[PDB]
């Protein structure tokens with residue numbers, strides 16, 4: 001299928017630049033215009049500009065002229081956007097999108113996987129992972145909720161999986177909130193009483209930004 | 222530049238019912254006999270996805286429950302019937318003139334029967350206590366509607382602040398929400414008091430749902 005794979009999340013200091021990529025597959029890269037679009041959390045979409053690969057020509061939203069630059073690498077079916085003089089205003093998700101249809105006025109038929117940009121001074125910090133299990137001597141009642149609290153990390157994001165994904169349907173992931181300039185999120189899973197604690201339960205927490213993974217066994221106190 | 226105003230900003234619809242989502246442009250978006258307005262669906266966490274192009278044409282792979290109408294300045298996206306996994310934000314976008322522009326989105330919520338939360342409370346882990354921190358956590362799971370108040374009590378006096386509340390997006394299978402509420406203290410303030418309570422107030426009951434523990438057991 002047509003895919004647009006975008007580069008991973010980027011943390012950049014205020015005033016610095018970032019350059020991000022969008023690799024096309026499943027079609028002829030040089031045959032289509034490539035557009036870029038800003039989405040600021042997690043609401044408004046704004047069109048940035050477009051580039052014709054093969055040829056080409058490029059153009060911009062006036063709002064993005066000083067700010068964005070579009071390039072391509074045809075040999076490697078990769079489109080690029082670079083953003084300069086970054087402010088917290090530019091912290092956002094950036095998408096590339098293929099233009100379809102017969103004309104300049106075409107719709108966007110495929111969107112890329114999105115690149116998240118954080119613009120900040122705060123330093124990359126790994127999270128502390130604490131278990132959330134019962135409790136005070138007893139379990140109650142027919143189902144048991146366990147959790148992990150993932151605390152004090154920067155930047156976003158983390159991934160929490162449970163028993164390497166064996167627990168799935170019951171998992172709740174709670175979006176991260178920023179306290180004291182560090183992120184805290186939590187994740188819960190619920191299992192049958194008759195199963196716990198005999199059947200052991202582990203949450204694995206990944207923070208790619210610090211290359212750290214932590215496993216926590218949900219022991220009872 | 223063309224402004225698109227969607228409405229409503231937010232829409233609750235029951236399973237099986239018809240959702241109507243409007244978009245008005247500040248200028249006609251018609252040219253050469255066509256209406257250059259498109260609709261996209263964005264499920265949370267995910268890239269947008271094309272539903273309808275040039276006002277009324279269904280993109281392939283998109284079910285015929287989605288349909289678009291309108292020309293000039295007024296456009297409509299209809300979802301009929303609505304299904305549990307239609308929970309998304311829908312966006313209109315014009316491409317009649319540069320720069321392309323987008324409506325501000327309409328968030329589709331599934332309306333379902335009321336459901337009380339299942340509340341679990343958890344003391345600070347001995348791990349965290351070793352760091353000198355102390356978070357008390359309360360999970361409020363599988364409730365509807367989204368609106369819920371959590372009240373934290375320490376030996377019967379209520380605490381704000383140090384409280385972080387965080388909701389999941391609406392479940393795309395059962396249409397419920399979950400919430401976590403975290404009260405963060407210092408290890409020393411934690412160890413100074415005994416009784417900790419998370420009280421959940423929701424429209425299912427005139428009566429708060431309470432979970433408690435006593436630090437000394």
Ligand SMILES: COc1cc(S(=O)(=O)O)c2ccc3c(S(=O)(=O)O)cc(S(=O)(=O)O)c4ccc1c2c43
Pocket residue numbers: 100101102103104105106107252253254255275
């Ligand atoms: C009479 O002129 C027509 C007619 C059609 S039609 O196929 O629906 O008759 C068009 C159908 C589609 C058009 C498309 S689209 O495929 O990207 O939606 C773009 C343009 S455009 O103005 O040259 O960018 C057009 C410009 C003029 C166009 C049409 C398009």
Ligand SMILES: [Zn+2]
Pocket residue numbers: 248318
């Ligand atoms: Zn005009």
Ligand SMILES: [Zn+2]
Pocket residue numbers: 170172363392397399
């Ligand atoms: Zn759930």
